[PDB]
Amino acid sequence: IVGGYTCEENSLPYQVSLNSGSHFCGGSLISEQWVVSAAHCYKTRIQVRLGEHNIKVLEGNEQFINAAKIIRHPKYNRDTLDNDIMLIKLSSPAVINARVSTISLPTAPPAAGTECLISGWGNTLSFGADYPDELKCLDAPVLTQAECKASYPGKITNSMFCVGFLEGGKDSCQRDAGGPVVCNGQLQGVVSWGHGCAWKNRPGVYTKVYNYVDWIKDTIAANS
Amino acid sequence: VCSEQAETGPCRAMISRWYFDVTEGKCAPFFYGGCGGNRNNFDTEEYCMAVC
Ligand SMILES: [Ca+2]
């Protein structure tokens, strides 16, 4: 997260981190057994970490659970990043509490101008690398479709939308992928891609969770 | 292929990888975003030095 601030200690109970040798992506806990992330974050083996704030410091609230099923969207396009969304089924149910909890699936599409909350342990610099140990947040508006298509001519698909600032300075970044965009208490977005981080006229591009609500439900039922 | 700059690409994941650096004449680590970029991009240093 570039241009953001440190999240309050217990505030995003649904934020998760995906882990192999190390933290490489975020995710969102949507039921006690299922996580939403990005398809491009797919690995063959993933441990999920819940209840985290400082990924380097054991604080006592964390749950570490291995993925038992990792499921990319059937129509995910590796060249266009169309349908960049993924489900992880945890091998045991997460224990729901003050520090580990579910975020709602959207009941409607995002509306331009809505202020959202984006979070993750992503890079905090637009040039160079500075990876944080503590969870960062960013308040950012949903942009209009015109704004989104103008910044990325010929690249915005039906599964994509933009959140951020055309003037740059504030954005998600590397290691934020798969993490949540939350608007009015609902998960509207999955961190996906962008040109640079926080560059002028290159807002972050996100997967539109609302378009996969039926897919999410059916997949969860098919794998119960 | 062995002379492309290390490109992290548009995706926002953080994946430890290797590229050949012409200036240093040896392979080095970089963080790759997980999609796009170019072929100067290896999983291991040994494999990088193998190709470059
Ligand atoms: Ca911790």
From Swiss-Prot, chain A:
<feature type="binding site">
    <location>
        <position position="54"/>
    </location>
    <ligand>
        <name>Ca(2+)</name>
    </ligand>
</feature>
<keyword id="KW-0645">Protease</keyword>
<feature type="domain" description="Peptidase S1">
    <location>
        <begin position="1"/>
        <end position="221"/>
    </location>
</feature>
<keyword id="KW-1015">Disulfide bond</keyword>
<dbReference type="GO" id="GO:0005509">
    <property type="term" value="F:calcium ion binding"/>
</dbReference>
<comment type="function">
    <text>Digestive protease that cleaves proteins preferentially after an Arg residue and has proteolytic activity toward Kunitz-type trypsin inhibitors.</text>
</comment>
<dbReference type="GO" id="GO:0005615">
    <property type="term" value="C:extracellular space"/>
</dbReference>
<feature type="active site" description="Charge relay system">
    <location>
        <position position="177"/>
    </location>
</feature>
<protein>
    <recommendedName>
        <fullName>Trypsin-3</fullName>
        <ecNumber>3.4.21.4</ecNumber>
    </recommendedName>
</protein>
<dbReference type="GO" id="GO:0008236">
    <property type="term" value="F:serine-type peptidase activity"/>
</dbReference>
<dbReference type="GO" id="GO:0007586">
    <property type="term" value="P:digestion"/>
</dbReference>
<keyword id="KW-0732">Signal</keyword>
<feature type="disulfide bond">
    <location>
        <begin position="7"/>
        <end position="137"/>
    </location>
</feature>
<dbReference type="GO" id="GO:0005576">
    <property type="term" value="C:extracellular region"/>
</dbReference>
<keyword id="KW-0479">Metal-binding</keyword>
<keyword id="KW-0720">Serine protease</keyword>
<dbReference type="GO" id="GO:0031638">
    <property type="term" value="P:zymogen activation"/>
</dbReference>
<comment type="similarity">
    <text>Belongs to the peptidase S1 family.</text>
</comment>
<keyword id="KW-0765">Sulfation</keyword>
<dbReference type="GO" id="GO:0043542">
    <property type="term" value="P:endothelial cell migration"/>
</dbReference>
<feature type="active site" description="Charge relay system">
    <location>
        <position position="40"/>
    </location>
</feature>
<feature type="disulfide bond">
    <location>
        <begin position="116"/>
        <end position="183"/>
    </location>
</feature>
Curated annotation (Swiss-Prot), chain B:
<feature type="disulfide bond">
    <location>
        <begin position="27"/>
        <end position="48"/>
    </location>
</feature>
<feature type="modified residue" description="Sulfotyrosine">
    <location>
        <position position="47"/>
    </location>
</feature>
<feature type="disulfide bond">
    <location>
        <begin position="2"/>
        <end position="52"/>
    </location>
</feature>
<comment type="function">
    <text>Functions as a cell surface receptor and performs physiological functions on the surface of neurons relevant to neurite growth, neuronal adhesion and axonogenesis. Interaction between APP molecules on neighboring cells promotes synaptogenesis. Involved in cell mobility and transcription regulation through protein-protein interactions. Can promote transcription activation through binding to APBB1-KAT5 and inhibits Notch signaling through interaction with Numb. Couples to apoptosis-inducing pathways such as those mediated by G(o) and JIP. Inhibits G(o) alpha ATPase activity.</text>
</comment>
<comment type="subunit">
    <text>Binds, via its C-terminus, to the PID domain of several cytoplasmic proteins, including APBB family members, the APBA family, MAPK8IP1, SHC1 and, NUMB and DAB1. Binding to DAB1 inhibits its serine phosphorylation. Interacts (via NPXY motif) with DAB2 (via PID domain); the interaction is impaired by tyrosine phosphorylation of the NPXY motif. Also interacts with GPCR-like protein BPP, APPBP1, IB1, KNS2 (via its TPR domains), APPBP2 (via BaSS) and DDB1. In vitro, it binds MAPT via the MT-binding domains. Associates with microtubules in the presence of ATP and in a kinesin-dependent manner.</text>
</comment>
<comment type="function">
    <text>Amyloid-beta peptides are lipophilic metal chelators with metal-reducing activity. Bind transient metals such as copper, zinc and iron. In vitro, can reduce Cu(2+) and Fe(3+) to Cu(+) and Fe(2+), respectively. Amyloid-beta peptides bind to lipoproteins and apolipoproteins E and J in the CSF and to HDL particles in plasma, inhibiting metal-catalyzed oxidation of lipoproteins. Promotes both tau aggregation and TPK II-mediated phosphorylation. Interaction with overexpressed HADH2 leads to oxidative stress and neurotoxicity. Also binds GPC1 in lipid rafts.</text>
</comment>
<comment type="similarity">
    <text>Belongs to the APP family.</text>
</comment>
<protein>
    <recommendedName>
        <fullName>Amyloid-beta precursor protein</fullName>
    </recommendedName>
</protein>
<feature type="domain" description="BPTI/Kunitz inhibitor">
    <location>
        <begin position="2"/>
        <end position="52"/>
    </location>
</feature>
<feature type="disulfide bond">
    <location>
        <begin position="11"/>
        <end position="35"/>
    </location>
</feature>
<feature type="site" description="Reactive bond">
    <location>
        <begin position="12"/>
        <end position="13"/>
    </location>
</feature>
